Amino acid sequence: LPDSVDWREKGCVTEVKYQGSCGACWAFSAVGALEAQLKLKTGKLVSLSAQNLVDCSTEKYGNKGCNGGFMTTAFQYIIDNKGIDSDASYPYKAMDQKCQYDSKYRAATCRKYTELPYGREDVLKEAVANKGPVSVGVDARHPSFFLYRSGVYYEPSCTQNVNHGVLVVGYGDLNGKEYWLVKNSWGHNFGEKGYIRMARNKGNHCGIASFPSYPEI
Ligand SMILES: *[C@H](CS(=O)(=O)c1ccccc1)[C@H](CCc1ccccc1)NC(=O)[C@H](CCS(=O)(=O)c1ccccc1)NC(=O)N1CCOCC1
């Protein structure tokens, strides 16, 4: 395993998106993971439809559109549905709509997904390096998270009580302090150009390694 990894360098991460008034962070976290796999298997990088998950991966999957969801059930939907549209053909309107999936504009498919063991940052590291970007949940209820702008984020009062779905696109160390490179979905005005570096190997800080998962085409 390399001392550091940044899947952006490998051209496997689309542009940071802005979820707006719709709390579909789970939707963005899920598509982000698939996008990296689509690129890794077709040399083509395309933003996948988050709206597609918000309108179609609903009750049967335990998801509530703009009111919250699960990355794993989002993957199962893509498998059951055998496809998901691209952002271009099924744009993000930031609100729940009637499912408008159209296989004519399918951009990717999913074969299965894997959930990693709870709290194991060493397994997450091995996955991020060898498999690609991993979808994880983090405790982002503290203001210190919102006010973030630079450096390795460390919040003493963080817990493993996750509530926000995001994407781990790499890891490394900045001045001795280890970190996870996390892509957020609050626009480019958050942290450093939409990303945030979170403390690594600090006892599953903010529960970043609590519920990791990634898709496989
Ligand atoms: C996205 C997070 S957000 O940007 O912090 C946000 C804060 C406030 C309002 C909107 C978004 C999203 C927010 C849900 C929400 C909550 C309250 C009001 C409106 C919207 N969070 C979720 O969708 C999470 C994602 C799953 S997780 O990463 O927390 C996780 C937990 C357990 C195992 C694995 C991963 N899920 C939910 O919030 N819910 C609630 C509804 O039922 C489905 C799951």
Alpha helices in 81-213 (DSSP H): 121-130, 143-146
Answer whether 70 contacts ligand 1 (Cβ < 6 A): yes
Catalytic (active-site) positions: 25, 164, 184
Q: What are phi and psi of 137, to 5 degrees?
A: -110, 140
Answer whether 65 contacts ligand 1 (Cβ < 6 A): no
Determination approach:
X-ray
Q: How far is the C-alpha of 92 from the C-alpha of 94, rounded, in Å?
A: 6
Centre of ligand 1 to C-alpha 57, Å, is: 15
Q: How far is the C-alpha of 95 from the C-alpha of 107, rounded, in Å?
A: 22
Give residue 131's identity as a one-letter amino acid code. K
Answer whether 144 contacts ligand 1 (Cβ < 6 A): no
Atom in ligand 1 nearest the alpha carbon of residue 19: 4
Neighbours of 66 (CB within 10 A): 16
Q: How far is the C-alpha of 192 from the C-alpha of 1, rounded, in Å?
A: 26
Domain ranges (residues) in the chain: 1-217
Answer whether 74 contacts ligand 1 (Cβ < 6 A): no
- For atom 3 of ligand 1, which residue has the closest CA? 164
Query: What CATH code is assigned to 1-217?
Result: 3.90.70.10
Answer whether 164 contacts ligand 1 (Cβ < 6 A): yes
Which residues is 108 bridged to in the sheet? 84
3-state secondary structure of 177: strand
**Locate tokens 């903010």: which residue?**
206
Atom in ligand 1 nearest the alpha carbon of residue 141: 5
Answer whether 28 contacts ligand 1 (Cβ < 6 A): no
Task: Give the distance, in angstroms, between the CA of residue 158 and the centroid of all CA atoms in the same chain.
Answer: 20
* Residue from 18, 26, 211 whose mutation best tests the ligand 1 pocket (most atoms within 8 A of CB): 26
Token reading at 201: 């190997």
Answer yes or no: are the C-beta atoms of 6 and 179 closer than 8 Å.
no
Token reading at 214: 């990634």
